[PDB]
Each structure stands twice: as structure tokens, then as C-alpha cells.
Amino acid sequence: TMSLGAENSVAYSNNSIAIPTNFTISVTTEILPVSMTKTSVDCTMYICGDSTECSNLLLQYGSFCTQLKRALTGIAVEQDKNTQEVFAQVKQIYKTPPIKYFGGFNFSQILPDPSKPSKRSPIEDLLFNKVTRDLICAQKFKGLTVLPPLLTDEMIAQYTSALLAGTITSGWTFGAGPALQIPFPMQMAYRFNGIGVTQNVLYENQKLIANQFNSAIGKIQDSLSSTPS
Amino acid sequence: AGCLIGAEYVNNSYECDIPIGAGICASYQTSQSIIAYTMSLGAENSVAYSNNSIAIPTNFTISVTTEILPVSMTKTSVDCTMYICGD
Amino acid sequence: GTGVLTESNKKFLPFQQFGRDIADTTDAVRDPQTLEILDITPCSFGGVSV
Amino acid sequence: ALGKLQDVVNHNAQALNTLVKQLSSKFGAISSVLNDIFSRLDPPEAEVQIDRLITGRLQSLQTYVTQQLIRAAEIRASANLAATKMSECVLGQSKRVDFCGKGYHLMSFPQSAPHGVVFLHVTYVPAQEKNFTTAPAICHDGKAHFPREGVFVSNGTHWFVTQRNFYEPQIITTDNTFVSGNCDVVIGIVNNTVYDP
Amino acid sequence: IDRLITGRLQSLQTYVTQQLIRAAEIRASANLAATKMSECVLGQSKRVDFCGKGYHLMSFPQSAPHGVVFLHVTYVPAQEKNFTTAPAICHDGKAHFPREGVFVSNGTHWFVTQRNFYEPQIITTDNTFVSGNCDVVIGIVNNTVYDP
């Protein structure tokens, strides 16, 4: 019988309170599809196939090859629009500064690596190495063609770099107007005020939180590589 | 994506007007002829990041935008006995 | 069928005459007169967009 | 401008134009007119010919209903989004970025539209920013003073405390700052003086 | 020939039908990704479980094949310790309610700490406001409210 989990009985009293004394910064991952494969079909090749007599009989079913091709065309435009509403949310394409000393936080795994020609971060490199005549050319010979997306993988990597050069060098200012510079140690001081804790919690424990963030972001490369699913 | 015969590839980058594919867009700009180009993602701004530098705005501008959202479609009602069997 | 009849490097067995692809499509064939194994590739097609 | 509203109108029009044109498509029969088949054919054999049309026309009508159910889900998703957006942007002030337009949402006004609704999101966009010198905390009486609600800025010589979204220079007093710890753990703490009221 | 043309035409419509239903599933996930791209990355969100499991601090978008990977930086408390609480305290006849915090006691003394971290501070007249007498609140204790 499937078990729901452990049975923890929280001791409830009229004068009992549990106030935390320490914190553990955790970096969790989230997977969401944004785009689908842009496909297109050919009526003449799929229905009959390398023939002329059958093509004449297909003319009777008139509005049956243009309603399907137009329906798949709307999907192709949809897939090119689902990427603009997600990645293309900022007008100016920001760039990371040369000096990458952000107070003690190491973003080397999420910032783009200029060494490789793809200009992608090590985290993104692991993602493209897991999400995979041949089958691609076989289906082409029947009418099934995979149209290429509008935004290439290189352009999407530039949109992500622009969203990271405004999240580290700035805060919530580049998504609601002009980009306002602000130190990263002072940025998280205001983000801590949103959850309830004051600013002295971050400054008096800056080195501790910096080590926890670097350790949490370092296990993401191992967690995704280890777990195949 | 294919072989574009009828346009010229200019090195300048503009906004995407007619999406072709694989980052290539087309437009009818000026002699008037169809030109092809690589779509530009936007301007290249560089935010100066320093350990003791912050930017505080001094003025503000109230902007009123618009957002169109469909609510309902055309309510249809077909007649099965009339559409299939016409008189 | 229709298509281009080019040479191939697929090593056929003596009793093998025809050859299909993964999607059940004739990709290679053995010539009846000469024991040469060709490569049937479809005629160049595609889709135009104006 | 009003392009999202003309999309659902042209789709319903095209759906009714392709459905009405399928009546002129012989689904393997001798003709497309029912009266011509019934008249120019004997009853036993006319059944075979008339069954090819009723099969195609009933399948073509089913294809229309199938597309209308998928299209209604898109409208229902846009209707639930507009109902949630109007309830959060018009009847309240939402703190969700980009939800009630781009920028700091102040208010919104709904307006009727043919088969839709047009929102007028009144946002707050800052402008005319200036570069200043900042510091996490200050040290006057050997103890660190953190900004309660604001940011410690400096014009080059003096130190002031301003808001996070509007430059309003104010003197650093013991009322807009709180003390926490000594001046040894905070990195980058400047030495300034506070003014006790 | 009318058996294969019709059979292949209906099978092609079956493909388009499933492609339109799966497009709505992708569009729903794309709208959720676009919503989290502006609420988790373009700012801090106070929605629980939305930008990760825990108190959301920051998020970093990462590109992926046919998708996006969000790295949510959350705040997770740990090392919990039990204390003794009280709604308000009574000094000089009036009740003192805390402005932003909670009254805790280590057994003998009373302090005021924030609701997400243990920072013991003395009960002053700057973090507690007076409102009402000491005969309506049930559970009020007696203490000394220091004043600067």
C-alpha cells in the first residue's frame, strides 16, 4: 500500500512558538516546455505518393488539403510567438561586466562562457547534451518536414544573458523601466526585506550566504547529470 | 531554411518585419527592393556595475498602456437536417 | 517508382534483392543484370513560399 | 491595434466559409446535388451513392465542431485571464510585474469592446536617474546603523538617505535607522555621523 | 482507391487534431513560463510555491531545448527552537502590542524577535505600540517596557 509520508505531530500549545535560528539557501530547478516542433505536411506526397492518376481523384476532396495545411501553419506561427513572450521580454540586450566580483557569489556556471564557440553557460551545456538513412530524412520523403524555428539557439542564449546581466547588476528595475545600477550585496538586502527578515541578517552573514549559494548552484550541475529523468 | 531567390542579404540589422526562418527576416526598404537581414534582438546597453554605485531616479513619467483580450466568440447553431439534407 | 539511382555502400546479402528504410520506403535495389546494389533516392522536391 | 479581436472574428468566418464550401465537394458520388441523385437513380442503387455524401458531410460537420471545441478552450483561457486581470488590476493594486502592464501598476480602467475587453493600465515608469555612491551601513557611535526604509546615498561629500524609487535627500537621524551589531562584520561600512533629535 | 485516399485523409486530420490539442498544452505551459519569467526573474514574488518551494528570493533563467529552466533561490529556515510566547504585555496599566515581531521568552526574560529569525532584542517603546487596557486581551503577561 502506497505510503503518504512520515507522521509528524506538531506539538500545539497556547504559549508555544518556534522561531528559526538559522537559514539554508536552496536552489531548486524547474522544467517547463516553451516551444514545440514546427511541422508541415504535403498532401500530394502523403496521400498518393509518386503517382498521377491518384492525384486526379484527390481533386474531388477540395477543401481538405488547404484546411489542414493552414491549421498547421497557425501552430508554426504560435511556436514562434510562444518564444517571444517568454524570452523576449526586455528591449535592451545587456552585457555582463568584465570584473565578475559580485560580493562573493560565483555565477560562473550560469553566465555565458566565452571560451566555447556557442557562448552558453556550463549549466546550459549540460541541458543540450541530454535533450536529444536516418529518421529525420526518412519522414521528409513522405511530406513530413520540420520547419526551423525563428529564433535560433544562439539568439535565445543572448536573451538569457540579457536577463542575467540585469538580474545581477540590477534588480527589479530593468523589468519596470530603465535599468538602475545597484550592488548585488545591497540587492539581496532588499530581497530579504520582502520575506520578512531585516537587512542585518544578510550583511552580518554575507560570507556564509555566499558559500551556501555557491554550494547550492554547484550541485545543480551534478543533480541534473546524475539523475537521468 | 532554404534558398531565398529574390532578395539581397544586407549586413545591417533591423527589426523583424517578415519572418523567414533561422533568424532571417525580410523587409521592403529603400531604389525599392526586398532585402534580407539577420534580426536584431535590441540595443546593446552596458550597465555600469560597481561596489559603491547606485542609481536612484529623480523624476517619473506616468504611462497608460493598452492590452487587448478576447472574451467571447460568435455563438453558432447549425441545422443537421438542413445542412446534410437540403430540401 | 521514381527517383535517382546512385551507387551505395550498403553490403547486401546474396539472397537480398530489395531494400526498405526505417519508414518502410524503398531506399536501395539490386540491378537484375549486373550484381550492383544501387541507392534509390527520391527526386528533388520541396515546398515554395512567396 | 485591435488585431486580437479581428482574429476570432475571421476564424469564425473562415470556419463557416470552409464548411459551406464542402457541400460542393463530391465525396466519391456521381454529383453533389441530392435531388439530382434521388431523381436520376433507382431507390436500391441510389442508397449507395447517397451514403457517400451523408458520410462526408457528417464528417465535415464533425470537423467543424472539433475545431470549435479547441477554439473555445483558447477563448475560455483568455476569458479566465481577463476575469482574473480585471479583478486584480481594476479592483485593486497588483504587485505582479508585467501583469497589469509594464511598470509599477497604479490603477487600471476597463472598457468594452466587440467580443473582448480593452484595459488601460496606468503604470509608473521612473526616469531621469543619477549615479550616486552607496554604502550598506554607517558607523558613528562604534555601532552599525542600517537604513530602515531607504538607501544610504552620497553626493560626493555628504551622506543622505533617500527612497528606493525617488531621490529625496534626507538627513540621517536615529529615527530612520536601526542599530544592529558593531562595526566589524559588515564589509564596506563607511564612517559617518548621525543626528539625534 | 477511395478506401486508401479516405483512410489516409482521415488519418491526416487525426494528426492535425492532436497537434491542436497539444498546442494548447504547450501554450498553457508557455504562458506559465512567461508569467514566471516576469514574476520570478523580473522581480520578487510573494506567491507561495510559485517561484520555487519556499520564500522566494531570486531566480535565474536558463535556456533549454524547447523549454526554459528556472533556478529559484529560496529561503528555507532551519534549526528551530521552541520558546514561550504571549499576545501582549502589560506595563503602567496599558497593553503593549508589538509592531513588527513576536514576543518570545527564554524562561526568565522576555524579548522581541522577528517572525522568521531569532534576533533577541530588548522590549523598548519604539517597537511596541500601546492600544487598550489590560483586561480585554486573553493571555497578556506582566513585564517591564524599557524606554530610552
XYZ file of C-alpha atoms in Angstrom:
711
model
C 0.000 0.000 0.000
C 1.384 3.395 -1.006
C 2.597 5.431 1.967
C 1.904 9.164 2.084
C 4.956 10.049 4.174
C 6.116 10.394 7.748
C 3.734 11.182 10.617
C 4.943 14.325 12.400
C 2.754 15.587 15.256
C 3.392 19.302 15.765
C 3.034 19.988 19.492
C 0.356 22.688 19.654
C 0.087 24.799 22.801
C -1.372 28.144 23.850
C 2.086 29.608 24.575
C 4.489 27.667 22.318
C 6.327 29.345 19.434
C 9.057 28.039 17.110
C 11.335 30.830 15.872
C 14.079 29.853 13.392
C 17.707 30.425 14.335
C 19.472 29.634 11.035
C 18.750 29.542 7.303
C 19.640 27.279 4.379
C 19.620 28.900 0.940
C 18.376 26.309 -1.551
C 18.449 26.487 -5.353
C 15.737 24.333 -6.934
C 15.206 23.566 -10.618
C 12.060 23.877 -12.733
C 11.352 22.477 -16.206
C 8.679 23.959 -18.478
C 8.214 23.468 -22.240
C 8.012 26.730 -24.168
C 8.043 25.618 -27.806
C 7.058 22.613 -29.913
C 8.426 21.221 -33.173
C 7.199 23.195 -36.192
C 5.854 20.600 -38.631
C 4.345 20.793 -42.113
C 2.669 18.159 -44.284
C 2.363 17.748 -48.059
C -0.974 16.444 -49.334
C 0.274 15.183 -52.701
C 3.170 13.145 -51.303
C 1.454 11.711 -48.215
C -1.930 10.815 -49.701
C -0.978 9.276 -53.046
C 2.808 9.265 -53.404
C 4.728 9.447 -56.705
C 1.606 8.998 -58.829
C -0.553 10.963 -61.260
C -3.852 9.061 -61.525
C -4.465 9.230 -57.770
C -3.724 12.966 -57.796
C -6.678 13.497 -60.139
C -9.076 11.714 -57.780
C -7.803 13.822 -54.869
C -9.197 16.957 -56.532
C -12.722 15.848 -55.584
C -11.908 16.392 -51.897
C -11.189 20.070 -52.483
C -11.225 21.812 -49.094
C -9.365 19.011 -47.338
C -5.727 19.824 -48.180
C -5.897 23.593 -47.520
C -7.693 23.488 -44.160
C -5.114 21.104 -42.689
C -2.084 22.959 -44.060
C -3.471 26.269 -42.787
C -4.195 24.738 -39.377
C -0.602 23.524 -39.044
C 0.563 26.939 -40.265
C -1.165 28.601 -37.313
C 0.735 26.266 -34.998
C 4.034 27.257 -36.626
C 3.309 30.945 -36.018
C 2.206 30.039 -32.487
C 5.502 28.311 -31.659
C 7.439 31.358 -32.911
C 5.214 33.555 -30.716
C 5.476 31.462 -27.532
C 9.235 32.155 -27.508
C 8.904 35.929 -27.943
C 6.536 36.242 -24.971
C 8.902 34.274 -22.697
C 12.492 35.129 -23.646
C 11.980 38.458 -25.462
C 10.686 40.463 -22.510
C 13.469 43.096 -22.378
C 14.240 45.630 -25.104
C 17.899 46.399 -24.417
C 20.326 43.464 -24.549
C 22.559 43.933 -21.513
C 26.076 42.533 -21.128
C 27.913 41.236 -18.082
C 30.684 43.493 -16.750
C 34.308 42.351 -17.106
C 35.003 42.330 -13.365
C 32.816 39.481 -12.092
C 33.273 40.148 -8.363
C 29.665 40.420 -7.161
C 30.347 40.387 -3.417
C 31.281 36.724 -3.170
C 28.664 34.993 -5.317
C 30.108 32.896 -8.155
C 27.849 32.989 -11.227
C 30.411 31.222 -13.430
C 28.025 28.316 -14.026
C 25.067 30.441 -15.181
C 26.901 33.228 -17.027
C 27.828 32.567 -20.673
C 31.295 31.108 -21.200
C 33.243 32.987 -23.903
C 35.705 30.105 -24.383
C 33.295 27.779 -26.201
C 32.012 28.998 -29.597
C 28.365 28.510 -28.556
C 28.616 31.244 -25.873
C 26.488 29.233 -23.442
C 26.794 28.692 -19.707
C 28.020 25.343 -18.316
C 24.513 24.714 -16.960
C 23.025 25.204 -20.430
C 25.741 22.983 -21.920
C 24.533 20.042 -19.828
C 20.929 20.690 -20.881
C 21.639 20.482 -24.623
C 23.645 17.261 -24.108
C 20.677 15.446 -22.534
C 17.624 16.609 -24.514
C 18.249 14.810 -27.804
C 19.041 6.750 -43.893
C 18.011 8.283 -40.565
C 14.529 9.038 -39.267
C 14.826 12.782 -39.936
C 15.426 12.203 -43.666
C 13.002 9.270 -43.935
C 9.967 11.277 -42.815
C 10.982 14.039 -45.238
C 10.440 11.732 -48.233
C 6.735 11.411 -47.339
C 5.774 15.064 -46.819
C 6.649 15.456 -43.135
C 9.063 18.400 -42.937
C 10.295 20.079 -39.750
C 10.402 23.830 -40.297
C 13.207 25.570 -38.378
C 12.261 27.980 -35.582
C 12.605 31.731 -35.998
C 14.873 32.335 -33.009
C 17.985 30.162 -33.129
C 19.701 28.618 -30.111
C 22.327 31.371 -30.281
C 19.741 34.164 -30.118
C 17.906 32.532 -27.205
C 21.236 32.325 -25.373
C 21.605 36.088 -25.851
C 18.142 36.739 -24.399
C 19.012 34.665 -21.329
C 22.300 36.549 -20.958
C 20.389 39.843 -21.082
C 18.031 38.603 -18.351
C 21.049 37.649 -16.206
C 23.023 40.873 -16.770
C 20.064 42.849 -15.415
C 19.338 40.490 -12.529
C 22.888 40.549 -11.114
C 23.957 44.125 -11.909
C 20.420 45.409 -11.270
C 17.244 44.183 -9.586
C 13.538 44.598 -10.340
C 14.282 47.913 -12.091
C 15.107 46.666 -15.610
C 11.722 44.943 -15.918
C 9.674 48.000 -14.958
C 11.555 50.825 -16.680
C 15.167 51.929 -17.076
C 17.990 49.753 -15.777
C 19.229 51.123 -12.440
C 22.655 50.053 -11.203
C 22.806 48.598 -7.687
C 25.420 46.452 -5.893
C 24.487 42.780 -5.597
C 25.183 42.659 -1.822
C 22.670 45.503 -1.493
C 20.232 43.845 -3.908
C 19.674 40.763 -1.741
C 19.401 43.034 1.308
C 16.160 44.394 -0.162
C 15.009 40.936 -1.279
C 15.409 39.732 2.311
C 13.055 42.506 3.444
C 10.365 41.054 1.179
C 10.249 37.723 3.021
C 10.250 39.269 6.499
C 13.839 39.281 7.740
C 15.707 42.567 8.082
C 18.841 43.773 6.295
C 21.242 42.976 9.152
C 20.656 39.255 8.580
C 22.360 39.385 5.172
C 25.208 41.808 5.890
C 26.268 40.132 9.145
C 26.257 36.748 7.352
C 27.338 37.719 3.837
C 30.223 35.244 3.649
C 28.019 32.409 4.926
C 25.254 33.017 2.375
C 27.826 33.406 -0.407
C 29.255 29.966 0.380
C 25.781 28.410 0.548
C 24.793 29.882 -2.824
C 27.994 28.651 -4.478
C 27.467 25.204 -2.950
C 23.798 25.113 -3.963
C 24.495 26.242 -7.540
C 27.325 23.708 -7.811
C 25.055 20.771 -7.026
C 22.717 21.693 -9.894
C 25.347 20.568 -12.408
C 25.653 17.274 -10.520
C 21.944 16.711 -9.844
C 20.935 17.103 -13.492
C 23.852 14.952 -14.695
C 23.294 12.159 -12.159
C 19.515 11.779 -12.424
C 18.636 10.645 -15.979
C 14.949 11.592 -15.563
C 15.680 27.062 -44.042
C 16.017 27.090 -47.835
C 17.180 29.093 -50.863
C 15.833 32.661 -50.871
C 15.885 33.787 -54.513
C 14.645 37.347 -54.916
C 16.265 39.284 -52.077
C 19.719 40.511 -51.082
C 21.410 39.890 -47.726
C 22.382 43.205 -46.138
C 24.813 43.208 -43.213
C 22.762 45.786 -41.295
C 20.455 44.520 -38.546
C 16.882 45.789 -38.250
C 13.610 44.749 -36.616
C 11.886 41.648 -37.954
C 9.073 42.506 -40.375
C 8.590 39.277 -42.363
C 9.881 36.185 -40.505
C 11.693 33.836 -42.879
C 13.392 31.384 -40.544
C 16.565 30.597 -38.622
C 16.956 34.204 -37.517
C 16.492 35.653 -41.020
C 13.861 38.337 -41.644
C 12.744 40.315 -44.691
C 11.554 43.870 -45.274
C 10.802 46.257 -48.139
C 13.141 49.202 -47.537
C 14.945 51.745 -49.699
C 15.508 52.124 -55.215
C 12.897 49.934 -53.506
C 13.765 46.237 -53.260
C 13.189 43.323 -50.903
C 16.152 42.957 -48.539
C 17.129 40.129 -46.200
C 18.918 40.562 -42.885
C 19.615 38.968 -39.516
C 17.039 40.086 -36.959
C 18.354 42.283 -34.153
C 17.332 41.436 -30.596
C 17.607 45.052 -29.450
C 20.105 47.669 -28.385
C 23.353 46.800 -26.588
C 23.317 48.676 -23.281
C 26.045 48.273 -20.661
C 25.010 48.755 -17.031
C 27.988 50.010 -15.025
C 28.296 47.704 -12.006
C 30.373 48.996 -9.090
C 30.655 48.037 -5.433
C 29.608 51.518 -4.237
C 27.457 52.898 -7.066
C 23.651 53.029 -7.121
C 21.187 54.746 -9.465
C 18.206 56.496 -7.855
C 15.672 58.143 -10.207
C 14.856 61.819 -9.731
C 11.706 62.193 -11.867
C 8.873 59.956 -13.067
C 6.556 59.548 -16.049
C 3.039 58.114 -15.809
C 2.380 55.868 -18.812
C -1.002 54.414 -19.789
C -0.698 51.280 -21.923
C -3.318 49.035 -23.521
C -3.945 45.283 -23.581
C -6.477 43.568 -25.848
C -8.019 40.325 -24.592
C -10.784 38.290 -26.270
C -13.715 37.347 -24.030
C -16.344 35.607 -26.177
C -16.676 34.243 -29.707
C -19.545 34.100 -32.179
C -22.234 31.699 -30.957
C -23.142 29.327 -33.793
C -26.029 26.897 -34.210
C -26.027 24.559 -37.221
C -29.032 22.623 -38.537
C -28.028 18.998 -39.091
C -31.143 18.025 -41.051
C -30.810 21.106 -43.286
C -27.041 21.137 -43.869
C -26.807 17.456 -44.798
C -30.279 17.166 -46.390
C -31.007 20.306 -48.387
C -34.755 20.254 -49.137
C 8.869 4.161 -58.731
C 10.645 7.439 -59.367
C 13.929 8.839 -58.130
C 17.670 8.960 -58.709
C 19.635 5.703 -58.966
C 23.076 6.329 -57.449
C 25.661 3.923 -56.063
C 25.572 2.714 -52.463
C 27.910 1.200 -49.877
C 25.261 -0.953 -48.165
C 26.545 -4.541 -48.169
C 23.620 -6.689 -49.305
C 23.362 -10.435 -48.828
C 23.265 -12.736 -51.897
C 19.563 -13.509 -51.471
C 18.680 -9.855 -50.839
C 17.099 -8.061 -53.804
C 15.115 -5.097 -52.449
C 15.771 -2.749 -49.550
C 13.490 -0.571 -47.424
C 14.124 2.240 -44.958
C 13.001 2.761 -41.357
C 9.701 4.273 -42.561
C 9.103 1.341 -44.952
C 10.322 3.108 -48.083
C 12.422 1.589 -50.867
C 15.907 3.071 -50.435
C 18.133 0.612 -52.327
C 17.762 -2.047 -55.013
C 19.943 -4.617 -56.778
C 20.166 -4.440 -60.567
C 18.896 -7.652 -62.234
C 21.548 -7.902 -64.966
C 24.638 -6.749 -63.071
C 25.001 -7.583 -59.369
C 25.317 -3.912 -58.436
C 23.495 -2.535 -55.394
C 22.268 0.987 -56.142
C 20.723 3.644 -53.886
C 17.193 4.829 -54.678
C 16.810 8.443 -53.533
C 13.584 10.335 -54.358
C 13.505 13.105 -56.952
C 14.407 16.533 -55.584
C 11.255 18.058 -54.086
C 10.328 20.697 -51.534
C 7.932 23.487 -50.697
C 7.945 27.027 -52.099
C 6.941 30.118 -50.122
C 6.482 33.552 -51.697
C -4.292 47.910 -32.932
C -7.492 45.863 -32.497
C -5.982 42.776 -34.084
C -6.684 40.164 -31.428
C -10.420 40.856 -31.716
C -10.475 40.564 -35.515
C -8.666 37.224 -35.220
C -11.581 35.442 -33.533
C -13.997 37.059 -35.995
C -12.050 35.986 -39.084
C -11.596 32.473 -37.676
C -15.336 32.005 -37.141
C -15.978 33.450 -40.604
C -13.403 31.177 -42.251
C -14.785 28.195 -40.329
C -18.249 28.902 -41.751
C -16.868 29.533 -45.261
C -14.955 26.247 -45.453
C -17.950 24.370 -44.032
C -20.356 25.851 -46.587
C -17.920 25.104 -49.432
C -17.671 21.401 -48.532
C -21.238 20.991 -49.837
C -19.828 21.415 -53.377
C -17.362 18.524 -52.970
C -18.390 15.140 -54.370
C -17.320 12.576 -51.755
C -16.953 9.863 -54.384
C -20.568 10.158 -55.561
C -21.888 10.890 -59.044
C -22.768 14.500 -58.168
C -23.228 16.866 -55.224
C -26.954 17.680 -55.541
C -29.194 15.377 -53.515
C -32.259 15.981 -55.693
C -30.323 15.036 -58.838
C -29.275 11.720 -57.276
C -32.721 10.861 -55.908
C -34.414 11.645 -59.225
C -31.880 10.182 -61.667
C -31.444 6.823 -59.902
C -33.413 3.801 -58.717
C -34.003 3.516 -54.940
C -31.765 0.446 -54.321
C -28.691 1.848 -56.081
C -29.292 5.474 -55.039
C -28.699 4.469 -51.410
C -25.064 3.586 -52.137
C -24.480 6.907 -53.894
C -26.327 8.999 -51.297
C -24.477 7.325 -48.411
C -21.158 8.693 -49.683
C -22.371 12.288 -49.347
C -24.006 11.952 -45.921
C -20.798 10.334 -44.661
C -18.615 13.170 -45.935
C -20.982 15.936 -44.846
C -21.424 14.468 -41.358
C -17.648 14.094 -41.026
C -17.102 17.638 -42.311
C -19.641 18.904 -39.774
C -17.881 16.922 -37.035
C -14.568 18.520 -38.028
C -16.194 21.931 -37.545
C -17.398 21.057 -34.036
C -13.969 19.646 -33.163
C -12.262 22.903 -34.147
C -14.869 24.922 -32.236
C -14.192 22.979 -29.027
C -10.439 23.573 -29.277
C -11.048 27.222 -30.177
C -13.401 27.616 -27.206
C -10.634 26.463 -24.854
C -8.436 29.301 -26.118
C -11.283 31.774 -25.588
C -12.051 30.319 -22.152
C -8.372 30.681 -21.241
C -8.422 34.296 -22.434
C -11.730 34.865 -20.628
C -10.428 33.489 -17.324
C -7.265 35.557 -17.786
C -9.308 38.707 -18.425
C -11.553 37.970 -15.437
C -8.532 37.472 -13.175
C -6.755 40.509 -14.636
C -9.770 42.793 -14.184
C -10.264 41.544 -10.625
C -6.601 42.210 -9.792
C -5.760 45.332 -11.843
C -9.042 47.271 -11.777
C -10.417 46.293 -8.348
C -7.056 46.562 -6.597
C -3.347 47.223 -6.974
C -1.370 44.168 -8.083
C 2.306 43.706 -7.214
C 2.867 41.254 -10.090
C 5.357 42.582 -12.636
C 4.175 42.847 -16.264
C 0.722 41.602 -15.236
C -1.059 44.974 -15.147
C 1.118 46.366 -17.909
C 4.823 47.152 -17.993
C 5.948 49.103 -14.933
C 4.746 49.723 -11.407
C 0.986 49.180 -11.527
C -1.011 52.081 -10.096
C -4.541 51.561 -11.446
C -6.462 50.336 -14.488
C -9.717 51.196 -16.252
C -11.858 48.651 -18.146
C -13.552 49.475 -21.441
C -15.991 47.449 -23.522
C -15.048 46.149 -26.962
C -16.658 43.899 -29.596
C -16.083 40.322 -28.388
C -13.445 41.396 -25.897
C -12.304 43.951 -23.340
C -9.654 46.683 -23.589
C -7.690 47.505 -20.439
C -5.956 50.839 -19.800
C -3.189 50.070 -17.313
C -1.834 53.201 -15.613
C 1.771 52.330 -14.771
C 4.620 54.134 -13.008
C 7.856 54.352 -15.017
C 10.816 56.146 -13.378
C 13.064 58.418 -15.416
C 15.995 60.839 -15.145
C 18.206 58.720 -12.923
C 21.539 59.785 -11.446
C 24.598 57.858 -10.266
C 25.404 58.128 -6.551
C 27.721 56.491 -4.023
C 26.105 53.904 -1.755
C 27.070 52.058 1.424
C 25.493 49.163 3.374
C 25.726 50.745 6.830
C 27.361 53.610 8.713
C 29.327 53.763 11.966
C 29.019 56.725 14.323
C 28.914 55.511 17.941
C 31.016 52.418 17.261
C 27.793 50.655 16.211
C 26.389 49.921 12.762
C 23.297 51.792 11.547
C 21.292 50.210 8.731
C 18.692 52.024 6.602
C 15.249 51.202 7.974
C 13.295 52.212 4.844
C 15.618 53.672 2.231
C 19.169 53.643 0.906
C 22.305 55.461 2.073
C 23.432 57.642 -0.841
C 26.159 60.268 -1.148
C 26.548 63.259 -3.461
C 30.341 63.184 -3.101
C 30.933 64.970 0.200
C 27.888 64.448 2.425
C 25.762 61.369 3.098
C 21.964 61.246 2.864
C 19.182 58.654 2.976
C 16.692 58.608 0.097
C 13.870 56.400 -1.127
C 14.350 53.348 -3.330
C 12.309 54.772 -6.240
C 12.570 58.574 -5.878
C 15.528 60.777 -4.944
C 14.524 62.711 -1.807
C 17.580 63.763 0.223
C 17.061 63.482 3.978
C 19.407 63.875 6.934
C 20.442 60.661 8.685
C 18.808 60.644 12.129
C 18.185 57.998 14.796
C 14.553 57.668 13.650
C 15.005 56.349 10.080
C 17.852 53.985 11.047
C 18.120 50.972 13.349
C 21.211 49.664 15.141
C 22.302 46.032 14.845
C 25.738 44.781 15.872
C 29.103 46.502 15.906
C 31.220 47.840 13.045
C 33.345 44.752 12.348
C 31.338 42.203 10.318
C 29.708 44.436 7.694
C 32.007 44.792 4.676
C 32.179 48.294 3.221
C 30.795 50.282 6.160
C 31.634 53.987 5.984
C 32.291 56.250 8.978
C 29.621 58.953 9.188
C 27.728 60.803 11.941
C 24.033 60.560 12.806
C 21.943 63.402 14.231
C 19.934 62.515 17.334
C 16.742 64.633 17.547
C -8.549 3.750 -54.271
C -11.364 5.528 -52.378
C -10.571 3.315 -49.368
C -6.938 4.483 -49.074
C -7.455 8.145 -50.012
C -10.218 8.483 -47.418
C -8.270 6.428 -44.884
C -5.108 8.496 -45.288
C -7.067 11.766 -45.314
C -8.835 10.927 -42.046
C -5.523 9.826 -40.523
C -4.022 13.180 -41.519
C -6.892 15.030 -39.827
C -6.289 12.882 -36.742
C -2.720 14.212 -36.676
C -3.794 17.853 -37.021
C -6.400 17.326 -34.295
C -3.817 16.018 -31.823
C -1.406 18.786 -32.845
C -4.016 21.434 -31.990
C -4.718 19.884 -28.581
C -1.013 19.556 -27.769
C -0.515 23.144 -28.948
C -2.905 24.321 -26.226
C -0.898 22.339 -23.669
C 2.304 23.983 -24.911
C 0.622 27.404 -24.978
C -0.570 26.931 -21.392
C 2.962 25.988 -20.336
C 4.368 28.889 -22.367
C 2.036 31.375 -20.668
C 3.050 29.946 -17.289
C 6.716 30.262 -18.264
C 6.131 33.833 -19.456
C 4.376 34.600 -16.165
C 7.228 33.149 -14.082
C 9.770 34.953 -16.273
C 8.311 38.299 -15.143
C 7.335 37.430 -11.554
C 10.361 35.342 -10.507
C 13.138 36.849 -12.658
C 11.980 40.445 -13.249
C 11.252 40.822 -9.535
C 10.459 39.151 -6.245
C 7.164 37.278 -5.933
C 5.255 36.738 -2.686
C 3.227 33.832 -4.122
C 3.824 30.583 -2.241
C 5.188 27.616 -4.235
C 5.105 29.730 -7.406
C 8.789 30.691 -7.654
C 10.077 27.525 -6.038
C 9.322 25.776 -2.751
C 9.973 28.354 -0.042
C 10.407 32.094 0.471
C 11.390 33.294 -2.997
C 14.488 35.485 -3.191
C 15.759 35.401 -6.786
C 15.506 33.323 -9.957
C 17.865 32.806 -12.898
C 16.505 31.806 -16.341
C 18.433 29.188 -18.316
C 17.785 28.251 -21.931
C 16.991 24.650 -22.831
C 15.903 22.700 -25.933
C 12.221 23.566 -26.468
C 11.893 24.990 -22.971
C 13.407 27.050 -20.175
C 14.946 26.029 -16.842
C 14.402 28.293 -13.836
C 16.856 28.221 -10.924
C 14.821 29.503 -7.973
C 16.813 30.729 -4.973
C 14.553 30.155 -1.969
C 14.816 30.861 1.753
C 14.467 27.745 3.916
C 14.612 28.136 7.719
C 16.388 25.536 9.833
C 17.489 24.785 13.399
C 14.123 25.511 15.034
C 13.965 26.220 18.771
C 10.881 26.322 20.988
C 10.082 29.399 23.084
C 7.249 30.838 25.178
C 5.028 33.465 23.555
C 2.394 35.932 24.724
C -0.030 38.119 22.725
C 0.816 41.357 24.557
C 2.441 42.637 27.741
C 1.094 44.969 30.430
C 3.152 47.871 31.786
C 1.958 51.036 33.547
C -1.616 49.790 33.142
C -1.634 49.807 29.326
C -1.113 46.884 26.951
C 1.927 46.892 24.642
C 1.443 45.186 21.273
C 4.467 44.563 19.029
C 4.741 46.489 15.769
C 6.775 44.007 13.672
C 7.816 40.927 15.614
C 6.793 38.356 18.200
C 7.217 38.232 21.977
C 9.439 35.313 22.994
C 10.757 34.182 26.369
C 13.819 32.098 27.220
C 12.318 31.038 30.558
C 13.069 34.066 32.738
C 13.348 37.116 30.455
C 11.134 38.361 27.626
C 12.359 39.616 24.251
C 11.000 40.595 20.835
C 12.241 38.867 17.678
C 11.235 38.895 14.030
C 8.872 36.225 12.719
C 11.492 34.495 10.536
C 14.769 34.693 12.502
C 15.810 34.679 16.160
C 17.269 38.119 16.932
C 16.694 38.801 20.644
C 16.137 42.494 21.346
C 15.004 44.345 24.452
C 11.359 45.424 24.582
C 11.551 49.192 24.055
C 8.912 51.872 23.454
C 9.975 52.072 19.795
C 8.996 48.562 18.609
C 5.772 48.256 20.653
C 2.640 50.406 20.430
C 0.079 50.890 23.203
C -3.600 50.258 22.484
C -6.188 49.443 25.154
C -6.171 48.363 28.783
C -5.055 45.038 30.324
C -8.478 43.459 30.854
C -9.649 42.523 27.329
C -6.751 40.586 25.777
C -6.747 36.952 26.924
C -3.232 35.725 27.650
C -1.490 39.003 28.438
C 1.530 38.743 30.723
C 3.190 41.299 33.011
C 6.629 42.690 32.174
C 8.707 45.897 32.074
C 8.771 48.023 28.912
C 12.096 49.856 28.776
C 12.139 53.379 27.367
C 15.187 55.241 26.012
